[PDB]
Each structure stands twice: as structure tokens, then as C-alpha cells.
């Protein structure tokens, strides 16, 4: 008769407070340090990847971002760390970060034509192109907004309105063109003193252009500060401008409002399927804790910065 | 002789890491699950339980909030979660969230009349009424501020400087009327291009009306955007205007400056006395932990989002 225990052919080790590198018998490692290194689907939904493109490049459709004209239902948006085709004409979309926040809860857009090109009878919708936004070696401009140059040497006040009779919210995009001098204004827009006045139930906005001498970004000394709103059902947007108006052409009806994220990752898209996606790669594991990265869309393990977490479920 | 332990014919249970339900002897519960379920006093001070109203409906005195024209000392302010009587005339208020934040440290106002109606020789004070702010069916407008329209076919410039001779900080409110078109500036006032210049030792404002079209909110299209300041003792507030001036007539003097909160709940007012208030029901207990709600005003238990939080202060 005896009292005792067993060991095994085990080399795995745990750490305690009072002693480190302690051998264990049949322990469970809760830290997943392995990833496939590729981007795959999330629960069978193909994500919206952006190759040298941005949210400002996609929503205001860049001519070099024409891969995303008709986007199906996604689950997260992948962007690269420094995308080259991002506001090819200089400027800054106002509340760009808040807009990227509001695209972290949207899984699908329907790009609808709320304002066609035929709905500008008194303005020029064809010459609004630039060499800073090229396409196939030719001048071009964004495809989801029209740069309205004067027609017949005249730019009247626009006073366009759109009532949202659709039962979903609409994301409406426009902008103001900050030129360099008054000569460029008089060349493009017949009225010297211009404004844009946006009115709806909640949002009130007046935009007087800031005509100033500026340096060269992307080849031209001009800026187009873009703006956005969300128009509710049975709510009407009212744009009024006698100049410098980058008018909307397409809107993005929000039909699937759920959960998503923006990853900012430069990983090539693989072809597999799993539940948890990380910017570096994918996890297909039911471990409690992952050290791979902080941001993990979907049902995932919890981020712990440590490199070795082995709960000792063994004698020694 | 023998050795052993007590048993007490009890069924109460405690939680351990390695086992979930263990029968226990003399366990002391630390979690206060229960509450009386109604709002009442803190140390004898009747709270400011404004009903179907908001902070902006109270400070700018809504015609539908008439019960609080002279508010006694309060320990906290309660507003319902979705109030209806608030900004009856469509509008907004800049730093409204900061105004609620600074009101959360104020326990008493003394409503003083800083500007009388006799201090408007050349401006109408009785025609400033609205149909979107009803009072016994008839049109009305906020009591505290007067929406000065022209008198005698013109709007003489309003150069009024008020000196704070009191020994307390004064909360002073005013606003600007962003009209919906220029014909209402021709009719309500006289000058088309108007400004509101507000000067303080620590504040500069040059508000201008945004005169474009907006949609219907509450039956009307104009937007009154309100503003506030806090004036120090021996500090002077200076108002200069030639139009769109929502001029002050009443101001609030900060007499007691302590601890309060802007609580959001719709529970009716009950009659009790306690030390802590939680929005769904007042806690009258000395336990270390409560699950009732995160926001609690007074000497209260710490909030822990859990169930069955009981320490085993006994054996078994």
C-alpha cells in the first residue's frame, strides 16, 4: 500500500508568484499565439476591403476607387494604413472621424441616385474635373458628387430640396470649394460673394468660402471641405447655394444597421471562413484569451498583452 | 472529548471559484437588491422633480412648465427620459451639455430680475408670442427671455451693459433667432444684416443669423439658438445688437454651490426621507453594494453589476 501520484512525458511550463518555469501535467494553454495571417469572411459575409482607398475615397467615390461602385453586404471595413487615393483633391471632410464612427454600426449601404445629373438644368455637370484626381491618365473628379461650374456664364442660387420619402435613413454628402483667389472664383463662379446654406429639421449650416493663398498639395492650390448629414424618414434636406457648391449626386440609404468596425490593415484577402477577425490576420479558436491585437470584430477572445498564460490544471 | 463545527439549519448559499452553490452558515449579504421604488427627499431638502419638462424648459421658462417659477432649495434635479415640454420654439442651446454639467454642482438658484420690461423703450415686449408654445391654448413664449421684435417700424441698436453688483455668480441667458427667410427679417425686424455682439471679461461672441430655409419642427421653421454665460462678482456683461435678439429679462443667482446631478427618470414623487437617491427607486440601506442603477446621488453603496454578491462570514 502507498500514497502518491504520477508524472508524464510533458515539457510545458507554468509560472507562479513564488516560482517560475514549473513543469505541469496535462495543463491547458488559454493564450492563442497563432493566426493564419490572412483576411477571410466573418460568418460567411465577405468584408468590404479597400486597396489603396479610404472611407473618404469610397463614400465620395474616388475615380481610382471604382472597385466599390456596387458594394454587397459586408461585416467590417478594411482600410490600409496610409492609402494613397484619399481625397485626391485636397481638403478635409468635416467630422470625418464622426462619420467613421457612424460607419462602425452599418453593415450595408444602398447607393441610390437622389439627385441625378439631369436635375441641374442651369449648371455645368461635365467639366467639373481635375488633374489632381486622375482616371486612366485623364482629368476626373469624384463620382458621388458633382462639382458645379457655371453654365452660360451664370450661376444662380440653387435652392434644391429633397424629401426623404424612403423609410430608411439617408447619408447625404456635399461640400464647399475653398478656392485660392477671387480670379479663380470669377473664372468658375459668376457670383463673387458665395455661400452654402444647408437646412433640415436639426442640422443648420452656413458655409462662406475661405478664399486664401495656400501651398500645393496633390498639384493644385485649392481645397474642398466636405460635409455630411443623416436625413431621417419624413425629413427634408434643403441645400441653397449661389456658388462653390459640390452638390450631391448619390446618397447611401442605410438598410442594415448592425455592428462593424474599421480595421486599418494592409493584409491580402484570403479565402476561408471563421467567426473572429483581427487586423493582422484571423483566429479560428475557442481560447479564452488572445494576445494577437486589441481590435477584434465579432465574438472573440479577450485581449491580454501577456505572451504566456498557461493556467495550471495539473499536479506538477 | 470531541472536536467539530456548528450547523444552523440554514439554506443560504455563497459562491466560490471552485464551486458555485455551497450551503453556508451565517453569511452576511452585501448587495442591496431592493428599493422603495419612488423619488423623495435628501436630508429634508425637497428635490427639484420637474415633470414632462427639461433643464432647457426650466431655465428658459417654458409656458408648459409653470410650476417652477420660484424654486426652493433642491438637492438634485430630475427630468423625464423623453420630455415633451422642451424648446417649444424649435432651437438648440450652445454648451447645453456643459450647462447641465455646471448645474450639477448648483443646489439653489435665486431668480432675480436683471432686466425689466420698462428697460425697452423702442422695442415690443408683448408681441413676442408663438403658436408652438401654448399657454392655456393661447400663443405664448418663454417667460425668462423676450423675443424683441421691432417697434414703430425700426429696431434701434440695443447697447445695454449690466454690472454684477452682487457677491455671487450670475447665470445669464439669451439667444439669437435664425429666421427661415429674409422676408421675416423684413417683417419681424427692420435691418436685413443683423448681429449680436456679446462682451464679457472672459467671453466674446459675434453671432449672426443663418437666414436660409429649414423644414417644419413643431409647426414652424425658424430656429432660436440660445446661449449662456456665468458672470463673476464686479464683472460686467455687455449686449450690443441690431436684430434677432432674444433679450434676457430674468437671470439666476448662484447662492448655494454644492453637489447635485441631472437625473433622468420618470418615477413619480413619493414621500420618504433617505440619504441616497437612485433614479428607479431610493435606497434606504447601509449595504456596501447596490445593483439598482449606476448614477446615485448621496452617500450610497458602490455600484456593481452583479447578482448574488454574498461573503461567507461563517463556516460551511
Amino acid at each position: 500500500i502507498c500514497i502518491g501520484y504520477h508524472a508524464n512525458n510533458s515539457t510545458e511550463q507554468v509560472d507562479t508568484i513564488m516560482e517560475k518555469n514549473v513543469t505541469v501535467t496535462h495543463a491547458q494553454d488559454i493564450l492563442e499565439k497563432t493566426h493564419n495571417g490572412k483576411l477571410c469572411d466573418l460568418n460567411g459575409v465577405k468584408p468590404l476591403i479597400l486597396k489603396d482607398c479610404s472611407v473618404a475615397g469610397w463614400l465620395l467615390g474616388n475615380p481610382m476607387c471604382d472597385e466599390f461602385i456596387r458594394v454587397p453586404e459586408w461585416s467590417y471595413i478594411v482600410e490600409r494604413d496610409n492609402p494613397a487615393n484619399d481625397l485626391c483633391y485636397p481638403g478635409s471632410l468635416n467630422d470625418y472621424e464622426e462619420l467613421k464612427h457612424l460607419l462602425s454600426r452599418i453593415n450595408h449601404f444602398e447607393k441610390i441616385l437622389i439627385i441625378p445629373k439631369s436635375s441641374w438644368p442651369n449648371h455645368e455637370t461635365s467639366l467639373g474635373v481635375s488633374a489632381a484626381c486622375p482616371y486612366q491618365g485623364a482629368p476626373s473628379f469624384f463620382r458621388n458628387v458633382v462639382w458645379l461650374i457655371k453654365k452660360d456664364d451664370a450661376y444662380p442660387t440653387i435652392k434644391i430640396s429633397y424629401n426623404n420619402t424612403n423609410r430608411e435613413d439617408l447619408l447625404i454628402l456635399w461640400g464647399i470649394h475653398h478656392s485660392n483667389n477671387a480670379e479663380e472664383q470669377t473664372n468658375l463662379y459668376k457670383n463673387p460673394t458665395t455661400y452654402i446654406s444647408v437646412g433640415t429639421s436639426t442640422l443648420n449650416q452656413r458655409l462662406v468660402p475661405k478664399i486664401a493663398t495656400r501651398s500645393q498639395v496633390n498639384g493644385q492650390r485649392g481645397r474642398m471641405d466636405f460635409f455630411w448629414t443623416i436625413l431621417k424618414p419624413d425629413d427634408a434636406i434643403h441645400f441653397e447655394s449661389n456658388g462653390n457648391f459640390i452638390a450631391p449626386e448619390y446618397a447611401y440609404k442605410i438598410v442594415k444597421k448592425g455592428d462593424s468596425t474599421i480595421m486599418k490593415s494592409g493584409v491580402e484577402y484570403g479565402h476561408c471562413n471563421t467567426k473572429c477577425q483581427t487586423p493582422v490576420g484571423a483566429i479560428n479558436s475557442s481560447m479564452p484569451f488572445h494576445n494577437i491585437h486589441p481590435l477584434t470584430i465579432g465574438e472573440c477572445p479577450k485581449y491580454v498583452k501577456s505572451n504566456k498564460l498557461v493556467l495550471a490544471t495539473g499536479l506538477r | 472529548i470531541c472536536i467539530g463545527y456548528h450547523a444552523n439549519n440554514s439554506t443560504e448559499q455563497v459562491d466560490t471559484i471552485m464551486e458555485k452553490n455551497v450551503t453556508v452558515t451565517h453569511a452576511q449579504d452585501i448587495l442591496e437588491k431592493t428599493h422603495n421604488g419612488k423619488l423623495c427627499d435628501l436630508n429634508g431638502v425637497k428635490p427639484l422633480i420637474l415633470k414632462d419638462c427639461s433643464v432647457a424648459g426650466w431655465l428658459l421658462g417654458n409656458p408648459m412648465c409653470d410650476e417652477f417659477i420660484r424654486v426652493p432649495e433642491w438637492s438634485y434635479i430630475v427630468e423625464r427620459d423623453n420630455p415633451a415640454n422642451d424648446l417649444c420654439y424649435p432651437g438648440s442651446l450652445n454648451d447645453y451639455e456643459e450647462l447641465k454639467h455646471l448645474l450639477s454642482r448648483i443646489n439653489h438658484f435665486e431668480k432675480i430680475l436683471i432686466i425689466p420690461k420698462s428697460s425697452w423703450p423702442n422695442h415690443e415686449t408683448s408681441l413676442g408670442v408663438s403658436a408652438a408654445c401654448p399657454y392655456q391654448g393661447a400663443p405664448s413664449f418663454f417667460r425668462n427671455v423676450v423675443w424683441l421684435i421691432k417697434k414703430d417700424d425700426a429696431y434701434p441698436t440695443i447697447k445695454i451693459s449690466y454690472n454684477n453688483t452682487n457677491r455671487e455668480d450670475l447665470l445669464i441667458l439669451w439667444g439669437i433667432h435664425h429666421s427661415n427667410n429674409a422676408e421675416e427679417q423684413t417683417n419681424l425686424y427692420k435691418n436685413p444684416t443683423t448681429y449680436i455682439s456679446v462682451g464679457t471679461s472672459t467671453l466674446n461672441q459675434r453671432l449672426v443669423p443663418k437666414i436660409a430655409t429649414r423644414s417644419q419642427v413643431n409647426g414652424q421653421r425658424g430656429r432660436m439658438d440660445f446661449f449662456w454665460t456665468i458672470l463673476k462678482p464686479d464683472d460686467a456683461i455687455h449686449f450690443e445688437s441690431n436684430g434677432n435678439f432674444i433679450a434676457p429679462e430674468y437671470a439666476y443667482k448662484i447662492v448655494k454651490k454644492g453637489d447635485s446631478t441631472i437625473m433622468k427618470s420618470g418615477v413619480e414623487y413619493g414621500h420618504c426621507n433617505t440619504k441616497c437617491q437612485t433614479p428607479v427607486g431610493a435606497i434606504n440601506s447601509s449595504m456596501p453594494f447596490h445593483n439598482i442603477h449606476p448614477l446615485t446621488i448621496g452617500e450610497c453603496p458602490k455600484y456593481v453589476k452583479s447578482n448574488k454578491l454574498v461573503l461567507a462570514t461563517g463556516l460551511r
Partner: antibody
């Protein structure tokens, strides 16, 4: 974009006038196409308005078997006024209303007006 | 239906002096959007109607800035500051609010 009204020039009371207007130098799409009558010295009267897809709107004040007609393939819209009774003598105008009365509520007016046409009903 | 009335019928105006043409009718001539729906049409003798000021107080392409308009609700006002001998016509005022569009009586302008 210009509009050219082609007219009969006279009609006896029993029959229906055949007054067409053809869009030359432009497109028929995405604009309201409306007929406006002008009797001699009695102002201007709006006969009707046809959106290209459909949704014909007549004038309640007078009903004269109005059949405003539209055809895109030929870039043409046409007017017929049967049951005429010699009160319809008019220097008719076709006009291109530049407005949308649906979700897009832009209204820019009747910019383009035809050269005109004359009809003295006898 | 909506019936308008020209308050002036003929305006002998010295060139270089602003004029005033006004018309009104029953309803408030403001659609759900809120942009006052009115137009003024010149209809020069021999020519055809031209938009001039539209949607209440906004000017057409090509028309010089001497034309302007104002008003909301029932009351309206056309005004041609520094009028010129090119500006002859009738200035019909059309209510564009509802389906049965109607016109004014016309203001035939004679050069003084």
C-alpha cells in the same frame, strides 16, 4: 434645348386638334412637359402637365376630352382637345417645366418656351 | 381655385427708377418644403415667356441683376431697379403651388 410646336392651324368644332411639340437640341427625360394656353386678351391658362413616365395632370377649370400624350423614342409630346366649341382659340405654348414634385422638390420654372403656334377655331 | 389679382395694371416708369409690381391670392403659396413658389414671366411682345425671377425671389440664368423680388405668404413684390428700355413686356405672375396653375392679369409696362 429648344421646343418646336407643330400645329394644324385651324379646326372645325366637332373634331380634335392635333398640336404636337418636339424637343430639338435636348432630351425628353427627367423634366415636366406642360401645355399652357393663351386665349386672345384673357391671360394665360395652364392646360396640363405630363411627367415623362406618366402621371398626367389636367386642368379642372375646363374639361375638353384632354389627352396630353408623350413619347420618348421620337422625343415628342402632343396635345389633343376634342369636343372643341370655339372657346379654345389660343396662341398655344408648349413649355418645359424644370421641376420635380416627388421626393426631389426642386422647382426652377418653365425656362424653355416654344416659338409659338396659332389656331383660330371656326 | 387659386385666383390672383394684379394690384398695378400698367406702370409708366421713367427709366433709371425702380418699379413695383405685386399680386396675391387666397392661400399662403408655400409648399411643404417651405420655398415660396412664385414665378414672374416677361412675355415680351412678339417673343415668348421667360423665367425672370423664380421660386419667389431668385433670378434666372442670363437675366441681369436689375431684377429682384421679395415677399412670402400672400404678399409679393417685383422690383426692377434701374429699369431699361429692354425690360418691356407684361410680367405675368404664376402661382406654382398646387396642380391647377394660374396666372395674373399682367402688367403692361410703357416707357415714360
Amino acid at each position: 434645348v429648344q421646343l418646336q410646336e407643330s400645329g394644324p392651324g385651324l379646326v372645325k368644332p366637332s373634331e380634335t386638334l392635333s398640336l404636337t411639340c418636339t424637343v430639338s437640341g435636348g432630351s425628353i427625360s427627367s423634366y415636366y412637359w406642360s401645355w399652357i394656353r393663351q386665349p386672345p386678351g384673357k391671360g394665360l391658362e395652364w392646360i396640363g402637365s405630363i411627367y415623362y413616365s406618366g402621371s398626367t395632370n389636367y386642368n379642372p377649370s375646363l374639361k375638353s376630352l384632354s389627352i396630353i400624350s408623350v413619347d420618348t423614342s421620337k422625343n415628342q409630346f402632343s396635345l389633343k382637345l376634342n369636343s372643341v366649341t370655339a372657346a379654345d382659340t389660343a396662341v398655344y405654348y408648349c413649355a418645359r417645366e424644370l421641376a420635380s414634385t416627388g421626393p426631389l422638390y426642386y422647382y426652377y420654372g418653365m425656362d424653355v418656351w416654344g416659338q409659338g403656334t396659332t389656331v383660330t377655331v371656326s | 381655385d387659386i385666383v390672383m389679382t394684379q394690384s398695378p395694371l400698367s406702370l409708366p416708369v421713367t427709366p433709371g427708377e425702380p418699379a413695383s409690381i405685386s399680386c396675391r391670392s387666397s392661400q399662403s403659396l408655400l409648399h411643404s418644403i417651405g420655398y415660396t413658389y412664385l414665378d414672374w414671366y416677361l412675355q415680351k411682345p412678339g417673343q415668348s415667356p421667360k423665367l425672370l425671377i423664380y421660386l419667389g425671389t431668385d433670378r434666372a440664368p442670363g437675366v441681369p441683376d436689375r431684377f429682384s423680388g421679395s415677399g412670402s405668404g400672400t404678399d409679393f413684390t417685383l422690383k426692377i431697379s434701374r429699369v431699361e428700355a429692354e425690360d418691356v413686356g407684361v410680367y405675368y405672375c404664376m402661382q406654382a403651388l398646387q396642380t391647377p396653375y394660374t396666372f395674373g392679369q399682367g402688367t403692361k409696362l410703357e416707357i415714360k
